[PDB]
Design a protein around this ligand. Structure first.
Ligand code: HEM
Ligand code: HEM
Ligand SMILES: CC(C)(C(=O)c1cccnc1)c1cccnc1
Ligand SMILES: CC(C)(C(=O)c1cccnc1)c1cccnc1
Lengths: 466, 466
């Protein structure tokens, strides 16, 4: 059971002492981040622990992080850690490995250029307006509002229209087929009973594969897989060139093997999976900060109105202008980096920056811990957007602050996500103010589980500026 | 169950139609070779079948074989197929993979040069003489003799002295610790109940790994592992530079990481495993041919006496002189290539000689089938050493005849095995003649199992030329 539990004392690396079979996992009872902050305090700049028998080497030196994330990414640190029986989703770009990942990343990169994002702004923006109508009635009847649902509704609407050109009011059609299935594509909690069992019985993943058991619900994937083959074959026979689905079909008509029909479906799914709950999550987090910091919220309302007088519609170019807006988004992602950790598997035996790392270790960068480290962040607990002001932004290490990771395997959806969220916040603050309620959790607490989500759902009062 | 059972009809490759879950394995009831000869007849030059869910692509074109075995060996076709829970023997060179194999092959290659083989001739040759004394009494009492045991005894004696400098008469000490354990290192029958179960439940290999269950008996490996660490640490404090163990310890004192103490032990074991039963097997096969072809046996006796008049001792240089001897050994290996198949896993998607081979297929070369194909071999069923005469040897394709495989991953022990066997045959035929018995199986039949061994053990009369 302790087959590899002696690796780190042989390399001279400090770490919590593992129990047989379980390794160190019992320390996840306070969750990944508190586990990581404490390891960082106690042991310093580098340390090791075991997810069961899997060695994991944490690193916090910005120079070493750059080597892993960008420098020898293609040679050594190309893939993330496996996490469960994925079925055909093995071909999704976030899951794919090595050379099929390089092929997939090269084939999907043009889809995320600012040119294609700029053509999608009018569609996203339309659901800014749907968000106001849905929120205008939730404020006109002064009931406290549950951000997650009003923002979930919004993220969903952006997802469906931006990926498949299906234009629905999900809040007012929670019965529609497309919103019924995507609502069940929730982020994975790697500390829940199932995924923890996997960590302690990783030898069970092939068994589950052979029974067609999949961490992606076997029925939503089927619905989308037929919906896509329905969309295509129909789409064939107009506007087009509007959504992701369309940009992907058109790349199947160009030195890399064009996406297969099934590779295509896999990417459509992973984009929905990445964007839906994450986007609503951060949007909830941003408003909680703006409600508990109404000076910040007001300074943002003023910047919105200066750029967009008369509740003028936001555009691509006006979004990129708004500097306080950018500052607020980044500072909310500092305190709540939805990822918590970045990881790569060490493909070979390598020495980086003076440290032998053996094959098969997963190297982990603990983003949440670095975003809250005193050694880089004055008053790290405080929501303080001025740290990203054009005056101070230059004294922040891009390898300490990595809300989207770094290097060739960074978030491919960063520009989109950033714009998507910004367009929401503008149209919302153009029409509304957000005040705390008796029911609001202040200060907010993070869950002890595996997702970076609030303990209790964020609820706030919302009054019409009108 | 039929997840991948449609791969070959998509590529247009012909093959027997697989059953769900089992693939094609029920056709192994007549064994690998008869399965392969029939596939070769029916489907031609290329075909596919499934060991359970594992696709296997057979190839018989000599040009394509060269690409796989030598040309793109390092890039694409570097590793053999996994076959069971191997524990620490994962570090043995025949099992090791990719870059650790390249390192291990480079670190062990000097150990098998003709210079080191030439220093080992006097030790091997000594057990030529032990073989005569043991056989002289088995013939002086005209009891039919069981080749496998008299040759097993011999192979064992060569193994122990050549690898560890332990000099025993195993036939006359079948109670000694070293002969008790190595006698249990028998070749694997991949058609036996266990290894067939593995093929149909390959998802069970990790499970067995985690229980420390190993196809290498957990106790013989331990005995040798302590024996080696005993040998060393003792060996330290004279002659030395005699056996494999010694050449390996000395390479631990030189751009490749010198063998670890455990890597070393693993290689000692695999050499014993490769050499012991195989050497006795072919030696049994050669004598069966010489008994059923006493003209051939006589022509060989005459060549031995011409080179070595007066029963003169064989030496390295005299062995390499003996051309009929070489011819007999090669022709016995044509009819009984102990390997049956050569295999490599296809690491990437590749096109070789006009054929797309997808990642993960194991490419198989069916040696037994090629050694008996009429299209290259006139009278292929007949034991006819003249096909390797200096007159006809040049019309034999080295990729059809591959008793040791070909390319950088060929048998590293070929020169040794060839000399080892030749030294046995000289001293034996110098003193003895081998005649059939009523009890001898004529014609010999091969087993329907997974090892290329005779149905019933070869038994023959042996008379002293003295
Ligand atoms: C607030 C919004 C988002 C955040 C903070 C975020 C963050 C991240 C992070 C931290 C990673 C790992 C980066 C690394 O390993 O170096 C990642 C990867 C990825 N993200 Fe996002 N993401 C967001 C939204 C999106 C959206 C809207 C998409 C839509 C397609 C998306 C698609 C992906 C993909 C496909 C990957 C894997 C890239 C690869 O392996 O090549 N993300 N993201
Ligand atoms: C009649 C005697 C022998 C025969 C016919 C034989 C045949 C073979 C064959 C057919 C292969 C596979 C080659 C390939 O995949 O291309 C092989 C590999 C190998 N043989 Fe032998 N062998 C014999 C004796 C020995 C002996 C005495 C040793 C002693 C060390 C040995 C060690 C090995 C090793 C280590 C490999 C794997 C090489 C690698 O993967 O780098 N063999 N042998
Ligand atoms: C799950 C997925 C696809 C992922 O690759 C991921 C997310 C955070 C950290 N590491 C990997 C993701 C999820 C949400 C936003 N972006 C990406
Ligand atoms: C089992 C082992 C080590 C092996 O690598 C092998 C043998 C025949 C075909 N393919 C691989 C072997 C066994 C006997 C002689 N040589 C090598």
């Amino acid at each position: 059971g302790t087959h590899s539990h002696g690796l780190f004392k042989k390399l001279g690396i400090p770490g919590p002492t593992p129990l047989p079979f379980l390794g160190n996992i019992l320390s996840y009872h306070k969750g990944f981040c508190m586990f990581d902050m404490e390891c960082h305090k106690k042991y310093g700049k580098v340390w090791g622990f075991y997810d069961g028998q899997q060695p994991v080497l944490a690193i916090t030196d910005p120079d070493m992080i750059k080597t892993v994330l960008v420098k020898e990414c293609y040679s050594v640190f190309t893939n993330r850690r496996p996490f469960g029986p994925v079925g055909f989703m093995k071909s999704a770009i976030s899951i794919a490995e090595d050379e099929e990942w390089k092929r997939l990343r090269s084939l999907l990169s043009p889809t995320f250029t600012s040119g294609k994002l700029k053509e999608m702004v009018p569609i996203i923006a339309q659901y800014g307006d749907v968000l106001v109508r849905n929120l205008r009635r939730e404020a006109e009847t002064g009931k406290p509002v549950t951000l997650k649902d009003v923002f979930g509704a919004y993220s969903m609407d952006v997802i469906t229209s931006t990926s498949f050109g299906v234009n629905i009011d999900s809040l007012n059609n929670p019965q529609d087929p497309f919103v019924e299935n995507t609502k069940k594509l929730l982020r994975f909690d790697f500390l829940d009973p199932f995924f923890l069992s996997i960590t302690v019985f990783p030898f069970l993943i092939p068994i589950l594969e052979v029974l067609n058991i999949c961490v992606f619900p076997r029925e939503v994937t089927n619905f989308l897989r037929k919906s896509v083959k329905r969309m295509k074959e129909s789409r064939l026979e107009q506007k087009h060139r509007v959504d992701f689905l369309q940009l992907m079909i058109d790349s199947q008509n160009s030195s890399h093997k064009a996406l297969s029909d099934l590779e295509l479906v896999a990417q459509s799914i992973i984009f929905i999976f990445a964007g839906y709950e994450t986007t609503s999550s951060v949007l909830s987090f941003i408003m909680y900060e703006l409600a508990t910091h109404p000076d910040v919220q007001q300074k943002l309302q003023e910047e919105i109105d200066a750029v967009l007088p008369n509740k003028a519609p936001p555009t691509y170019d006006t979004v990129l202008q708004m500097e306080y807006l950018d500052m607020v988004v980044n500072e909310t992602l500092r305190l709540f980096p939805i990822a918590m950790r970045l990881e790569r598997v060490c493909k070979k035996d390598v020495e980086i920056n003076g440290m032998f790392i053996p094959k098969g270790v997963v190297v982990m960068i603990p983003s949440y811990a670095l975003h809250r480290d005193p050694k880089y962040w004055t008053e790290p607990e405080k929501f303080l957007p001025e740290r990203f002001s054009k005056k101070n932004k230059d004294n922040i290490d891009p390898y300490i602050y990595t809300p989207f990771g770094s290097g060739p395997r960074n978030c491919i959806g960063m520009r989109f996500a950033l714009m998507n969220m910004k367009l929401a916040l503008i149209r919302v603050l153009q029409n509304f103010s957000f005040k705390p309620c008796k029911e609001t959790q202040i200060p907010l607490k993070l869950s002890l589980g595996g997702l970076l989500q609030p303990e209790k759902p964020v609820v706030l009062k919302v009054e019409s500026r009108d």
